Design a protein around this ligand. Structure first.
Ligand SMILES: O=C(NCc1ccc2c(c1)OCO2)N1CCN(C(=O)c2ccco2)CC1
Length: 120
């Protein structure tokens, strides 16, 4: 299955699944400064799933690796903001990260395989 473009609809599908997960609620929109006015003191580069979906739909990812880097930044920002590993929102981030990694694995493998076939 050597389709170089297939990753994009596969990532749209996976983002739909992540938006159906109750565990994504805190990560569906950029963090609000009013409620967390010190957020930018802690977090250099904010990221959320609506920004990832918009970047994809605009045609501003070249590869599923770039999308994966932004999704992993949502989870690292959560781990860096949490006061404890026993926090509600950090706990939601760890379950969502395990779901994301389970599903993105084949998307990355199939893409890299398609690019190797193209250069064969
Ligand atoms: O305030 C927000 N997210 C905004 C938001 C809230 C509700 C929403 C929404 C967006 O879209 C749909 O319903 N967060 C708090 C800070 N944080 C953490 O990772 C973290 C770790 C420990 C404590 O917080 C990121 C998430």
């Amino acid at each position: 299955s050597y389709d170089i473009q297939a990753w994009k609809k596969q990532c749209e599908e996976l983002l739909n699944l992540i938006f159906q997960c109750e565990d994504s609620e805190p990560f569906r929109q950029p963090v609000d400064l009013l409620e967390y006015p010190d957020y930018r003191d802690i977090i250099d580069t904010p990221m959320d799933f609506a920004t990832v979906r918009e970047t994809l739909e605009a045609g501003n990812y070249e590869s599923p690796m770039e999308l994966c880097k932004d999704v992993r930044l949502i989870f690292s920002n959560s781990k860096a903001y949490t006061p404890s590993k026993r926090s509600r929102i950090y706990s939601m981030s760890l379950r969502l990260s395990a779901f994301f990694e389970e599903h993105i694995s084949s998307v990355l493998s199939d893409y890299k395989s398609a690019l190797r076939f193209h250069k064969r």
